[model samples]
Target chain A: SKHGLTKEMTMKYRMEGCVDGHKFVITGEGIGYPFKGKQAINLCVVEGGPLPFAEDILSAAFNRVFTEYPQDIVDYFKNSCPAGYTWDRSFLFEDGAVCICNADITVSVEENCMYHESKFYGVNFPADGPVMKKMTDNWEPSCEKIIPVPKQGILKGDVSMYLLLKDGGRLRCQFDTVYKAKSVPRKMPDWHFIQHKLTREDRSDAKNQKWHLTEHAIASGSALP
Target chain B: SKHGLTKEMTMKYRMEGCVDGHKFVITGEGIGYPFKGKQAINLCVVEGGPLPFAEDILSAAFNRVFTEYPQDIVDYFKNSCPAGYTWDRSFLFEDGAVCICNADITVSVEENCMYHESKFYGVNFPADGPVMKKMTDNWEPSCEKIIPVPKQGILKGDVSMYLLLKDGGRLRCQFDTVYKAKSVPRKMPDWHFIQHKLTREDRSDAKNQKWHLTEHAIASGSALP
Candidate 1:
C-alpha cells in the first residue's frame, strides 16, 4: 500500500548556517507521503544568506524533521492519498543574496519493520547557478584545536554546549579534558598525555526515544573498535 | 494467526541442580503451540532429583533456550499458524528431591507493522505444592562471611566459582576480598569493605542471542540479592 503527499499538510523546519563569511537562515515547509512503498515529500525553502556551514546545518535540520515528524507525516499522507497513486511537483527556495535554490525537494521514506529508510531528491541548487558559484568560490574552513599538553604543568578544563529547539526544548552537551605527565621516567621522552570525557543530556520532555548514543571504550593497545 | 504444537514436535531440556545435601537431575520433553494470542507448551517431566538451586538452574536454562532459539521458534510458529488465530499451553520442569512446578506458561506475540510484542503468562511454580513444602523445610542458609577489616593477626583468602553447562560450555566467576584496618581512624569502627564484580562470556557457537548476563558489580554498602 502507498500514499502520496497532498497540499493540505505541511512539514516545517527552521535552521541557521554559516558558509565562510556569509550567514544564512532557512525556513522550509513541505507536504510528504508514500508512493509505491516509498515516502515522498515536496518542500519549499525560504532561506537567506551567503550561508556558512550550509552542509552541516542542512544535514541537521532535515535529519531532525524526518526523524521527529514521522507519525504526523505518515498519518497525513495515508488520510489524503489513494493507494498506489503518484503526484509530481516542484518546491523552490528564494529570497537570499546567496541564492539558495530548491528546484524541487522531494523526500521519501521506506518502512522497514522497527526501522525506516529515507531518501531525498531535488534538494540541491543548480550546478551552473550564480549562488552555487559564489558559495563554492568563497567557502573557507573554520579553525579549532584542543591542546594536548600544557607547557608548565597539569591543566584541566570543562566545556559545555546547549542547543535550543523551536518547540522550546533543549539539549545539553558537556565534556572535561585534562593533561598531565608527572610520573614519567627520567630517561623517557616528554610525553603529551591528554584525556577527555564527554556526555550529552536531553533536557526536553518530548520522549527522546532512541536519539542518544550508548557509551563504549577501548584500551590503547587493543585492536578492537 | 495461530498454530498448535503437534505430538510429533517435542520440547526438550536436560539440566542439573543441587541445594544443601539434595541433588536432582531432570529431563523434559513436551509439545507446544500458540493458544489465544500466546505460546503454550505441554511438557512431561521424566526425571528425578533432590534438586538444589532450582531457581538459579531454571533461570539459566530457559534464559539460554529462549535466547538461543528465538529465530527457530518464531519461524516454526509463523510457518504453521493461520492468520488471525491463536493457541495456548504450558511447559513444565520436574524430578528432584525439592519439588519444582510450573502452573502454565502462556506467551503471546502481536504482529505489528514492523515488529512483534510478546506477552508472557503464568511462568511460575505453586507456593503450596509438596515439593515446595519439602524444599522449604529442608532449606538451610549458607554461612558465607566476608571480613573486610580483619584483626591484627588475621588472614584472608580469595574465593571464585565456575559453572559448566551441559553443552560443553563453561562460565567462570570470581571475586577477591581483602581485610585491613590501617586506613581507618580510631573513632570510626574499622569499616569492613567488600567489593565484587561478575562477568559472563558466551563461548558456544549455538547462536546465543540475549542469553548471557551482562557485566555487573557490587560496592560495600549495597544490599545482597
Candidate 2:
C-alpha cells in the first residue's frame, strides 16, 4: 500500500543515540528538515525538561498510538483503503514518541497519507523521581533496536535516562548514565535534511553520511508555546 | 474472600452431553450456563442455529468468540479509557449490543431469601475435537446416554428453553422441543432465552428424570402446525 510514490507515504524512525539510557531518533523529515543527515535530539527533553517525558510518557503515548489511534482513524475512514503495504519513517523526529520503550507505536496504515500521532501528556518528571539505574534495567527492550542512521549520535544532558520502544512498540524510559554526552544544551538544534535514497551501492559505501543535527524551536520550556 | 461464606449454597449435576468432536466430563457448575454439565461435556454455542446453515457452524462460532470478539472489544474500548483499570458496560456496548457472555441478565431475588434466580447464556463444549468418537461409538449405551450429556451430541430441532433452579441452588437450561417436534421443512428455529439461572436446586435435578413421550411430535411428513 505504501508503494505509491505520489500518493501513499509511510513514516518510520530509528534510535540513533541514547542519553542516560534513553534513545532518540528521527523519522519522516518534515518541511525544512532534510531527507538525511539531520539531527534534533538536543532540543528535546526526556521525562521532564520539555520534550521526552520519562519512559512512562513515551510508553503511554505509543501504547495509545498502537491501540487507540488506529482504530479511531479506521472507524472514521473505513471506505478508503489500500491493498497491502509497508514503509519506514526513521528520519522524522529524534526522540520521537514512537521510539520510547514500552510505547505501543507500531502503527498500521490504511487509506493513503492518513497518519495519526499520540503523545504522552501530563509527564511531570523530577517530581516523579530521578531516573535510576535499577528502574532503567526493568524497562523492557524494543523488539527492533531503535537503530539510528549512522551520521548522527544522540546528545542529552544526562546519561542516566535510557530509551527503548516496547510493550508492542511503546517507548520505555530508564536512566542509564553510560553514554553521556558533554555538549551544551541547545535551545534549538539546527535541523538538517537529506533526500538521497540509499542506493544499492551506497548501502555499503555510505557509512556516516546519513545523519545531521538541527535545533528545534523551544517554546519557553514548554512543548506548546 | 470466598472463605467467609458460612451459609453458601451448592448444587451439582452429573449428566452426559456432547458437542462437536470433543467429549468431556465437566465436574464444576456455576450460577448459570458456564459449563454444559455439572459433571460432563457442556455445549456452548456462540449463536444458536435455525438448522444446518453450512459446514463448521460450531467451529465458526467458536473462532468468532475465541478470536474476533476479544480483539474487537479490546480495540473498541481503548479510545474511551486508559489501561490497567476495570471497564464498564457503556464503554463496551453503546447500544446494548456488546455482551460480556455473562453480565447482561435479569435476576429475581426475595428480600428475605439468601438466594436469587437469573438467566445466563453460554456454551460449554470440550476444549478439543477428538472426543466426538466416544459418543458416536455408544449409540444407545443407556437411557441417560440418549441425550448426550457426558459425550458429544447434536440437538437437531426447534426447542423452547428454560432455566431451572434446583432446590434453590444450581441453574440450568430446560429444553422444550415443542416447535422442533414438527415434521421436516420446519420453520427457522431460534435459540431464544439462551441461558437462565436458577435459585432452587430441586428443579435443576428434574431435568434428568424420564417423562413418557406423549406422542411423536415429528414423524415422516407430518407438520404440527
lDDT of each: 0.25, 0.19
TM-score of chain A of 2: 0.22
Writing each residue's lDDT as its tens digit, candidate 1 over B73-188 gives 22222332222112121223232122222211222233211111111222234444333332321111111113222234221212222233343332322222222222222222
Where does model 1 exceed 4 Å of error? A1-7, A15-27, A33-39, A42-225, B1-8, B16-27, B33-39, B42-225
Candidate 1 chain A, poorest ten consecutive residues by summed lDDT:
A216-225
Candidate 2 lDDT over A124-212, as tens digits, reads 23333323221221222111111111233321111112232322222223221111112212222221110111101111122222322
* Residue A45 accuracy (lDDT) in model 2: 29
What is the TM-score of candidate 2?
Answer: 0.20
RMSD of candidates 1 onward, in order: 28.5, 25.7
lDDT per residue (tens digit) for residues B1-225 in model 2: 111111222222222222332232222222221112111112222222221111111110110000111111221111111110121111111112111111111111221111211122223323332111111110100000001111212212211111112222211111212111111222222111111111111111222311110000111110111
Reference contacts reproduced by model 1: 0.00
